[PDB]
Design a protein around this motif. Structure first.
Motif, short mmCIF file in Angstrom:
data_model
loop_
_atom_site.label_atom_id
_atom_site.label_comp_id
_atom_site.label_asym_id
_atom_site.label_seq_id
_atom_site.Cartn_x
_atom_site.Cartn_y
_atom_site.Cartn_z
N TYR A 207 -56.03 13.82 -33.73
CA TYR A 207 -56.25 12.71 -34.65
C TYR A 207 -57.71 12.70 -35.10
N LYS A 208 -57.92 12.45 -36.39
CA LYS A 208 -59.27 12.35 -36.95
C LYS A 208 -59.24 11.15 -37.91
N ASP A 209 -60.24 10.26 -37.79
CA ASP A 209 -60.35 9.09 -38.63
C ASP A 209 -59.11 8.23 -38.65
N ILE B 247 -59.66 13.48 -31.59
CA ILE B 247 -58.92 13.13 -30.39
C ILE B 247 -57.79 14.17 -30.21
N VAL B 248 -57.55 14.62 -28.98
CA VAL B 248 -56.47 15.54 -28.72
C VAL B 248 -55.61 14.78 -27.75
N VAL B 249 -54.33 14.66 -28.11
CA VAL B 249 -53.38 13.91 -27.31
C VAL B 249 -52.32 14.85 -26.77
N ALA B 250 -51.94 14.67 -25.50
CA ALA B 250 -50.85 15.42 -24.86
C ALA B 250 -49.70 14.44 -24.66
N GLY C 57 -62.04 6.88 -31.66
CA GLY C 57 -62.20 8.19 -32.31
C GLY C 57 -62.75 8.03 -33.73
N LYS C 58 -62.29 7.03 -34.48
CA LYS C 58 -62.82 6.83 -35.83
C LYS C 58 -64.27 6.33 -35.79
N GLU C 59 -64.59 5.43 -34.84
CA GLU C 59 -65.94 4.86 -34.73
C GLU C 59 -66.97 5.88 -34.23
N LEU D 1 -59.70 21.68 -19.97
CA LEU D 1 -60.23 21.63 -21.31
C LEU D 1 -60.95 20.31 -21.55
N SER D 2 -60.49 19.25 -20.92
CA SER D 2 -61.15 17.98 -21.16
C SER D 2 -62.54 17.98 -20.54
N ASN D 3 -62.74 18.74 -19.47
CA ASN D 3 -64.06 18.79 -18.87
C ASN D 3 -64.97 19.61 -19.74
N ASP D 4 -64.48 20.78 -20.14
CA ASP D 4 -65.23 21.71 -20.97
C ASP D 4 -65.67 21.17 -22.32
N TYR D 5 -64.97 20.17 -22.81
CA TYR D 5 -65.35 19.61 -24.09
C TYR D 5 -65.77 18.17 -23.95
N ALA D 6 -65.98 17.74 -22.70
CA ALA D 6 -66.43 16.38 -22.42
C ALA D 6 -67.56 16.08 -23.39
N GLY D 7 -67.50 14.93 -24.05
CA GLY D 7 -68.56 14.59 -25.00
C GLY D 7 -68.37 15.08 -26.44
N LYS D 8 -67.56 16.11 -26.65
CA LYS D 8 -67.32 16.62 -28.00
C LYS D 8 -65.95 16.18 -28.53
N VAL D 9 -64.96 16.08 -27.64
CA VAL D 9 -63.61 15.72 -28.07
C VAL D 9 -63.09 14.70 -27.05
N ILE D 10 -62.28 13.73 -27.50
CA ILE D 10 -61.69 12.72 -26.61
C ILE D 10 -60.26 13.21 -26.29
#
Length: 112
Positions: A85-87, A27-30, A20-22, A49-58
């Motif tokens: 999480y970010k950076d 990142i969205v964690v459940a 996610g930092k690289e 939601l993970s499909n809908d944002y595939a490529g934009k959010v992990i």
């Protein structure tokens, strides 16, 4: 289920936070548990939601019983809990199985 990464160890947890930092993607964690009722209820939405944002959010999934070390360091007490999480660090969270709020959280962080 839609492109959700299952975390099986602290090592995988650290590797995925670094990704996610690289890649400079949030990142969205459940944090879930097999014994958790509302977690099962919301799990389909998280996957969609993970499909809908595939490529934009992990998207990552952590079964707290299976990976205690992570659950503990993350300080979770109620389930489900979602973290952003970010950076390499926690930047936002949501506790509970509110569908409308989970959507709002992802949209917020996905839109930069």
């Amino acid at each position: 289920g839609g492109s959700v990464i299952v975390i099986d160890s602290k090592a995988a947890w650290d590797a995925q936070l670094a990704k996610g930092k690289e890649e400079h993607k949030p990142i969205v964690v459940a944090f879930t548990a097999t014994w958790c009722g509302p977690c099962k209820m919301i799990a389909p939405l998280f996957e969609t939601l993970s499909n809908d944002y595939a490529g934009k959010v992990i998207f990552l999934k952590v079964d707290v019983d299976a990976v205690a070390a992570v659950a503990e360091a993350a300080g979770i007490t109620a389930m489900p809990t979602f973290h952003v999480y970010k950076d390499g660090v926690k930047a936002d969270d949501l506790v509970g199985a509110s569908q409308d709020k989970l959507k709002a959280l992802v949209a917020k962080h996905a839109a930069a």
